Write a protein that binds this ligand. Sequence first.
Ligand SMILES: CCCCCCCCCCCCC/C=C/[C@H](O)[C@H](N)CO
Ligand SMILES: CCCCCCCCCCCCC/C=C/[C@H](O)[C@H](N)CO
Lengths: 51, 48, 96, 246, 246, 287, 287, 49
Amino acid sequence: ATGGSTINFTNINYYKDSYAASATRQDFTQDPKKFTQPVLDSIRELSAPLN
Amino acid sequence: TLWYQTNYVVPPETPGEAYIIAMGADLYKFTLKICKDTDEVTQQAVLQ
Amino acid sequence: VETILEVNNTTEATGLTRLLIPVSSQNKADELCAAFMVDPGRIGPWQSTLVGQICRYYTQWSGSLKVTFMFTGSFMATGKMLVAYSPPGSAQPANR
Amino acid sequence: SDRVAQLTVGNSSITTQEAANIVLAYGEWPEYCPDTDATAVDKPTRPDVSVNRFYTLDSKMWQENSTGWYWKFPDVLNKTGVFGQNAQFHYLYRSGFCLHVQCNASKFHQGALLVAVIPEFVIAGRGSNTKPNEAPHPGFTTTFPGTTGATFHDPYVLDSGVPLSQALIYPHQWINLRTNNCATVIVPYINAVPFDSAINHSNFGLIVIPVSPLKYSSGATTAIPITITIAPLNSEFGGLRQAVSQ
Amino acid sequence: SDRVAQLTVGNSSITTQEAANIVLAYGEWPEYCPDTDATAVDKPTRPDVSVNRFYTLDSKMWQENSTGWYWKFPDVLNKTGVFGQNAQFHYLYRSGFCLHVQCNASKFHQGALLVAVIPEFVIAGRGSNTKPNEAPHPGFTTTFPGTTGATFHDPYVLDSGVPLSQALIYPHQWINLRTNNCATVIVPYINAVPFDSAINHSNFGLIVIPVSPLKYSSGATTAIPITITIAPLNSEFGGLRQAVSQ
Amino acid sequence: DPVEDIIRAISSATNVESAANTTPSSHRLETGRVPALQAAETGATSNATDENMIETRCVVNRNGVLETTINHFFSRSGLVGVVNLTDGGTDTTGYVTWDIDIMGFVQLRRKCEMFTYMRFNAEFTFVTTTKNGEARPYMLQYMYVPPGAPKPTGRDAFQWQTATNPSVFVKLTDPPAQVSVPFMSPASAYQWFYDGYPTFGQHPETSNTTYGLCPNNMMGTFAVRVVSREASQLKLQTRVYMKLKHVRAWVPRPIRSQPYLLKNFPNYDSSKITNSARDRSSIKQAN
Amino acid sequence: DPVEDIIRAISSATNVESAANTTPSSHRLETGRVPALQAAETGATSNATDENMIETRCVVNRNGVLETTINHFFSRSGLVGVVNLTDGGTDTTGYVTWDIDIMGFVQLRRKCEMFTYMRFNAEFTFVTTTKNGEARPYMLQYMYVPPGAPKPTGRDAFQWQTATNPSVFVKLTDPPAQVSVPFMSPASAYQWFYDGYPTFGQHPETSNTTYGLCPNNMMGTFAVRVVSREASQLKLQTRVYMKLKHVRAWVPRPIRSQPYLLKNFPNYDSSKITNSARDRSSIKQAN
Amino acid sequence: ETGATSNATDENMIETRCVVNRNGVLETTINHFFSRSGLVGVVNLTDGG
Ligand SMILES: CCCCCCCCCCCCC/C=C/[C@H](O)[C@H](N)CO
Ligand SMILES: CCCCCCCCCCCCC/C=C/[C@H](O)[C@H](N)CO
């Protein structure tokens, strides 16, 4: 945290093109549930999977 | 370690042995830092 | 994602039987079966797991691992096992 | 939603896919000693997760001539883990238990096991001597078997001179190899005093007996063990001193 | 209302009629690990009164040639009491300490003792060898003396290569035989990690040194001991496993 | 705040003043509802009832349930002991002590041993007669000698001054003496079964004579004399009857089928075990 | 409810932007109030001040206190290492690795060792020259090889592909390279003193080479080469200067008076101990 | 056999404490993982004799 009044500037671009710029803007998005649990019928952690 | 709690008990006429398959993964708590280059790969000459 | 720990990684394990843990009816009760170190970025059965490859591009790791065991028997095969985890310390436990 | 159970105590946990409910002895849960019942003034110690957890003894193997086994509690645990250490440094012990017994076999096997919990379980000398001098008594290794368990000479009279058929008064369960592979009983602290010495006195014994013998047709698995896993719910210790194993 | 003190911890208590205040190292009290600083997920154990209490080592006897002694903490306590047992069955230890040193003599005696608390106290090989191969190192029995304590070969440089005169940066006190017969320091848990292994790592050493030597005119008492009594304030343990003494 | 992890019985009671009634029940033809099938592997008894097994009528049941309570079951006097006071010619002690153990006589012993823990009061009656039977007009002394108290050494010895010990003075021609006794256990209940040893130390594997002997049951000694100077020539027995009252009981246990041998020990014959039920000719003939 | 027994720092912070002022104080003639007498046996320093010892004037003190903070004290670049890259004729490796330990050079080592625990960032500058001194126009590669990463086996070996490892490409004629480095310790602070062993097991009493070596300080290796195919004939040193910034420090400890010997060990001479203060002719002559 | 990974967690397997976890997750994104320069090719220009 901290960094009071550090006036950061990075993403400013000197060219008319978008791909000339510098990464990132980051991303915090995740969706593990599509790779880890890609099943039709949802299964709870309490219940046994197969009944 | 993986120990026998009781025993692998099987009726007559059935195979006398089986196989466990083990798998591994991470939980929501898992993280990493200071990215580097792996040790598994080796190269000698430029791939043609 | 769960991928397959290669616990039988030893020699004379042929090609694909390296992934299997043999279970049969014992004689002396209270027997050991298989053992592996927990370090996912270390040489051993974790070297074949996806999580073992990605933690190997990084210098450090933190978190909880998970180890899933799937028994392929006949429907008629029954049994119980004890899957134990011992934090750092004296070497591999000698007894159950 | 019945036959599948999981029990989690401490850093240990137990799963069973084949189970018949759970018995709660005398309709009570284990609990800490209330201020009104307590007597000793000093402050008890309560380790919680380091003591309360599942310990697993060695397995007793199961034969056609087997007459059945018994253990004593806390005695089986006095040498093991942090529970065994606290009970040696303290003069005053209190707690309950959760008892779990694993025996499995295959749909071609058969038999039944009586699992009971006997408060104040007193073994008995075997002999015709009516003089308290010449009359025989059991040895310490018999009265308090330890981890290794003991065996019945006369399982019918329960070695105490009392019929097995009426053992169903105690909190019990059966392992019937066609029905369930485990028996679980949750025992409260029972005693005529709030605290006692874990070393000198065992609250209750556990009993596994073949009412109906093991049978299997040739070619099936001959080796059946009986494993025991017990956890000390709600433990307290008082009267701290040096270590005494007995 | 100053020179008379009583300290009560657990079932143990300490009285002193001659005392110079009390030192609270770095202005903090011992405390349990906050949820924000903690890392390990499992639940720690907190015995309270069974671990936290005054343990008393043997007494070091006090002579004219004595160069001074040191101990390591928790190491001195790893074999004693219920504190020694918990530290063997757990991989993760945290706590503070309360240190108390008793040396008394009579109004015709004289001397002074420097009592300090040194975080991360590293002993040092003694020799002129500049090659890390041929260079000497101290033995395990030296690095971690145990209950029996160790002694200084060079008390002036504190065996670490550092001048004794600047030891007054650490939390300290003096026993000046004309003024006070005890020195008491209350040490918080200090370390760069919240938990650690009591067996592999000692947080801090204790140091008793004769800056001014003992003198008494003939006919008075020649035998002066130095006794040490230490209590583990606010203890936690985690990572329960089998027992490891080292 | 900084560390968070730091921050009953299913069964209930009901008054029953009479035996249970019976409601009318008709037949059932349908699936899914099965009162008969039980599973005893859960240790619980079958809850199936009269009314779901057959078709029943209505029965208002005024049979009384009252006589079977532990108060009425255990409040009766029965013999806990017998004391033989010679006092006659030849070798003459002049008094007899009886340590108080009510396990010495089987008939009242088997009722108590249905239970592990008991807390009660007591009513003791002392019926004393002569050798064959009779009552002469001799004065008697029944003295209670609690643990730690001096036992009397002679007929006239000073321990009979009883400035503290309770005593009863009675003539053989008087109706039998009687007193009420409290619950004197230093624990919270009497216990007839103690699995354990009274003290620490190393226990012999060959012969353990201290196994199973609870300290909490040691109530002291009962001692008799004939109040007199010289001696009498008579010989008398005192029979001791204990009634239990205000009694509470805990943790029921099975009833003993084997013959008793010793007072303080449940020793039975490893040979010779007697079956709990008599034997018939075949399992297919009920009679 | 049923079991009841189940149911800070004195020092504070103040901003100081300048040296302390001095208030006027007159004499004192009276008993009971004694600023001079101290007792050091409590481990606390004398709190006596200018103004209670003598008579003082008033001094407004605008001397600055700022330059002595741990930020300004520790933010300077000083040499942490030297790396010798032959690359020349005869036996030629073609590269040199330097394990990163800043304890190798005494002058910056003694400043750090005033403290037990330190958490900081870093600014590394790489000044490379030739054997005597010069700069030619050769391209260089400075690569960081973190723990567990493959170390390069040759001048041209594949580990220089650096698809992941950070690397710096620079010409000897360019101004010295410079980068910022974070706090990479797997613990929460660096520690220059570790009393303890990294692993369990039985420790030799004869020679303990593992005593005092903290694992948490192992940062990997720094490796140099000359980017090229055949080889150069030059021979060059790279000097490595580390600046500390954003630094925090804990638990101050005494400053080392004895000569250092080894990087990783505080070994000193049992013979030959040098006194901390030079010796004069007599204690009675100040000069 | 459903191809889905075990959803069991720390907290239902054992008894746990409370851990506020400020470890950063950021460095492992595909942007930071793949933004580094590494050698894709080498070109040999003789031009000599
Ligand atoms: C005036 C004479 C009065 C006699 C009073 C005697 C009262 C003694 C208390 C009786 C309470 C029950 C006896 C104790 C139980 C069993 O005997 C124990 N097994 C003894 O070992
Ligand atoms: C492009 C090249 C960049 C080089 C980056 C190297 C950064 C390494 C981290 C330096 C942090 C301080 C070093 C650690 C402290 C002491 O050396 C320890 N005693 C090591 O044993």
